[PDB]
Amino acid sequence: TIDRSMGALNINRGYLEPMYFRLGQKSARHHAGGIDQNMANKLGLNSD
RNA sequence: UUUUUUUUUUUUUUUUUUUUUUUUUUUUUUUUUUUUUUUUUUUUUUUUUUUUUUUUUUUUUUUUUUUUUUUUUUUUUUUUUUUU
């Protein structure tokens, strides 16, 4: 989902586990914005 | 200055009780009976040079004021009278 070039890789292995693959797909976009610990204090970043 | 008061008068031996009387061995149980190897998976397949900009153009002396003018001696009071 993140790297466009990544996806031409061949990953048709026997331990794909699509359920965890789907969760990763949802993690990139549908999970959340993902704001990590901010050294700079952005108090108005809720709308950001 | 001083003027009062300021000894003593009771009670204060003793009378009970104070040995002992129960109980105080023992009576169960107390081996063991399962299970206890193993059977998957486990190489790799993307991307990964570069393409902009990047000298300078202003201003930048000075113009005022800046001596002084008053006042500045003194004028009271200031022993004692009781009691103890």
mmCIF file of C-alpha atoms (C1' of nucleotides) in Angstrom:
data_model
loop_
_atom_site.group_PDB
_atom_site.id
_atom_site.type_symbol
_atom_site.label_atom_id
_atom_site.label_comp_id
_atom_site.label_asym_id
_atom_site.label_seq_id
_atom_site.Cartn_x
_atom_site.Cartn_y
_atom_site.Cartn_z
ATOM 1 C CA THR A 1 0.000 0.000 0.000
ATOM 2 C CA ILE A 2 2.790 2.460 0.869
ATOM 3 C CA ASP A 3 5.563 1.635 -1.612
ATOM 4 C CA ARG A 4 4.292 1.577 -5.195
ATOM 5 C CA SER A 5 7.356 -0.338 -6.393
ATOM 6 C CA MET A 6 6.814 -2.934 -3.666
ATOM 7 C CA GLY A 7 4.129 -5.136 -5.176
ATOM 8 C CA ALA A 8 6.152 -6.491 -8.059
ATOM 9 C CA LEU A 9 7.741 -8.771 -5.456
ATOM 10 C CA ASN A 10 6.702 -12.425 -5.636
ATOM 11 C CA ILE A 11 5.194 -13.396 -2.275
ATOM 12 C CA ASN A 12 3.023 -16.380 -3.249
ATOM 13 C CA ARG A 13 4.332 -18.429 -0.335
ATOM 14 C CA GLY A 14 2.570 -21.143 1.642
ATOM 15 C CA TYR A 15 2.264 -19.045 4.820
ATOM 16 C CA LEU A 16 0.613 -15.921 3.438
ATOM 17 C CA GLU A 17 -2.108 -15.701 6.134
ATOM 18 C CA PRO A 18 -4.425 -13.299 4.259
ATOM 19 C CA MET A 19 -6.217 -12.249 7.458
ATOM 20 C CA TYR A 20 -3.050 -10.606 8.769
ATOM 21 C CA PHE A 21 -2.292 -9.345 5.261
ATOM 22 C CA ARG A 22 -5.686 -7.621 5.188
ATOM 23 C CA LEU A 23 -5.042 -6.043 8.592
ATOM 24 C CA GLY A 24 -1.816 -4.557 7.253
ATOM 25 C CA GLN A 25 -3.699 -3.134 4.276
ATOM 26 C CA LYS A 26 -6.211 -1.544 6.652
ATOM 27 C CA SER A 27 -3.367 -0.399 8.912
ATOM 28 C CA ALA A 28 -1.814 1.859 6.265
ATOM 29 C CA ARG A 29 -4.998 3.781 5.413
ATOM 30 C CA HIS A 30 -8.123 2.807 7.383
ATOM 31 C CA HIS A 31 -6.487 2.433 10.805
ATOM 32 C CA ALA A 32 -5.646 6.006 11.872
ATOM 33 C CA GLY A 33 -3.469 8.992 11.069
ATOM 34 C CA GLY A 34 -0.756 7.770 13.422
ATOM 35 C CA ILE A 35 0.684 10.771 15.255
ATOM 36 C CA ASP A 36 3.822 9.650 17.092
ATOM 37 C CA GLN A 37 5.351 11.404 20.124
ATOM 38 C CA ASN A 38 5.834 15.043 19.112
ATOM 39 C CA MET A 39 8.925 16.847 20.380
ATOM 40 C CA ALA A 40 7.323 20.071 19.149
ATOM 41 C CA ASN A 41 4.095 20.713 21.059
ATOM 42 C CA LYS A 42 1.332 21.146 18.468
ATOM 43 C CA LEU A 43 -1.724 21.868 20.597
ATOM 44 C CA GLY A 44 -3.794 22.840 17.550
ATOM 45 C CA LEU A 45 -2.891 19.710 15.588
ATOM 46 C CA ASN A 46 -6.241 17.997 16.220
ATOM 47 C CA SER A 47 -7.610 19.497 13.002
ATOM 48 C CA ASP A 48 -4.231 19.025 11.303
ATOM 49 C "C1'" U B 1 7.999 58.689 117.598
ATOM 50 C "C1'" U B 2 4.604 55.433 120.356
ATOM 51 C "C1'" U B 3 -0.382 53.383 122.257
ATOM 52 C "C1'" U B 4 -3.751 45.574 119.937
ATOM 53 C "C1'" U B 5 -3.023 40.560 120.859
ATOM 54 C "C1'" U B 6 0.491 36.687 121.531
ATOM 55 C "C1'" U B 7 1.182 29.601 128.085
ATOM 56 C "C1'" U B 8 -2.008 25.247 128.998
ATOM 57 C "C1'" U B 9 -6.841 22.303 129.397
ATOM 58 C "C1'" U B 10 -9.395 16.013 123.796
ATOM 59 C "C1'" U B 11 -8.266 11.143 122.610
ATOM 60 C "C1'" U B 12 -4.463 7.543 121.857
ATOM 61 C "C1'" U B 13 -3.474 -1.565 124.921
ATOM 62 C "C1'" U B 14 -6.298 -6.037 123.644
ATOM 63 C "C1'" U B 15 -10.868 -9.175 122.345
ATOM 64 C "C1'" U B 16 -12.499 -12.597 114.419
ATOM 65 C "C1'" U B 17 -10.901 -16.432 111.378
ATOM 66 C "C1'" U B 18 -6.769 -19.154 109.546
ATOM 67 C "C1'" U B 19 -5.088 -28.614 108.521
ATOM 68 C "C1'" U B 20 -7.396 -32.338 105.215
ATOM 69 C "C1'" U B 21 -11.593 -34.882 102.367
ATOM 70 C "C1'" U B 22 -12.514 -34.741 93.667
ATOM 71 C "C1'" U B 23 -10.402 -36.802 89.457
ATOM 72 C "C1'" U B 24 -5.937 -38.232 87.027
ATOM 73 C "C1'" U B 25 -3.380 -46.276 82.304
ATOM 74 C "C1'" U B 26 -5.185 -48.353 77.601
ATOM 75 C "C1'" U B 27 -8.967 -49.703 73.543
ATOM 76 C "C1'" U B 28 -9.378 -45.886 65.637
ATOM 77 C "C1'" U B 29 -6.918 -45.798 61.158
ATOM 78 C "C1'" U B 30 -2.175 -45.864 58.794
ATOM 79 C "C1'" U B 31 1.316 -50.946 51.340
ATOM 80 C "C1'" U B 32 0.002 -50.930 46.031
ATOM 81 C "C1'" U B 33 -3.465 -50.680 41.598
ATOM 82 C "C1'" U B 34 -3.811 -43.960 35.936
ATOM 83 C "C1'" U B 35 -1.025 -41.793 32.133
ATOM 84 C "C1'" U B 36 3.775 -40.534 30.391
ATOM 85 C "C1'" U B 37 8.132 -41.710 21.829
ATOM 86 C "C1'" U B 38 7.071 -39.584 16.909
ATOM 87 C "C1'" U B 39 3.883 -37.681 12.603
ATOM 88 C "C1'" U B 40 3.240 -29.183 10.345
ATOM 89 C "C1'" U B 41 5.990 -25.470 8.056
ATOM 90 C "C1'" U B 42 10.753 -23.271 7.395
ATOM 91 C "C1'" U B 43 15.650 -20.521 -0.474
ATOM 92 C "C1'" U B 44 14.675 -16.532 -4.059
ATOM 93 C "C1'" U B 45 11.552 -13.135 -7.419
ATOM 94 C "C1'" U B 46 10.257 -4.555 -5.945
ATOM 95 C "C1'" U B 47 12.777 -0.095 -6.303
ATOM 96 C "C1'" U B 48 17.341 2.434 -5.531
ATOM 97 C "C1'" U B 49 22.410 8.547 -11.058
ATOM 98 C "C1'" U B 50 21.252 13.631 -12.783
ATOM 99 C "C1'" U B 51 18.026 17.932 -14.577
ATOM 100 C "C1'" U B 52 15.867 25.017 -9.799
ATOM 101 C "C1'" U B 53 18.008 29.332 -8.030
ATOM 102 C "C1'" U B 54 22.272 31.586 -5.848
ATOM 103 C "C1'" U B 55 27.047 39.736 -7.875
ATOM 104 C "C1'" U B 56 25.533 44.921 -7.350
ATOM 105 C "C1'" U B 57 22.035 49.412 -7.508
ATOM 106 C "C1'" U B 58 19.011 53.620 -0.432
ATOM 107 C "C1'" U B 59 20.619 56.925 3.178
ATOM 108 C "C1'" U B 60 24.515 58.299 6.442
ATOM 109 C "C1'" U B 61 28.675 66.775 8.498
ATOM 110 C "C1'" U B 62 26.682 71.247 11.022
ATOM 111 C "C1'" U B 63 22.798 75.125 12.461
ATOM 112 C "C1'" U B 64 19.010 75.758 20.340
ATOM 113 C "C1'" U B 65 20.128 77.275 25.123
ATOM 114 C "C1'" U B 66 23.735 77.358 28.983
ATOM 115 C "C1'" U B 67 26.946 84.438 34.739
ATOM 116 C "C1'" U B 68 24.427 87.219 38.687
ATOM 117 C "C1'" U B 69 20.145 89.924 41.291
ATOM 118 C "C1'" U B 70 15.913 86.903 48.371
ATOM 119 C "C1'" U B 71 16.571 86.300 53.397
ATOM 120 C "C1'" U B 72 20.001 84.999 57.211
ATOM 121 C "C1'" U B 73 22.219 89.130 65.672
ATOM 122 C "C1'" U B 74 19.259 89.860 70.217
ATOM 123 C "C1'" U B 75 14.606 90.953 73.225
ATOM 124 C "C1'" U B 76 10.286 84.987 78.035
ATOM 125 C "C1'" U B 77 10.783 82.247 82.428
ATOM 126 C "C1'" U B 78 14.069 79.653 85.618
ATOM 127 C "C1'" U B 79 15.417 79.866 95.199
ATOM 128 C "C1'" U B 80 12.167 78.465 99.353
ATOM 129 C "C1'" U B 81 7.300 77.917 102.234
ATOM 130 C "C1'" U B 82 3.275 70.224 103.715
ATOM 131 C "C1'" U B 83 3.795 65.985 106.467
ATOM 132 C "C1'" U B 84 7.345 62.706 108.155
#
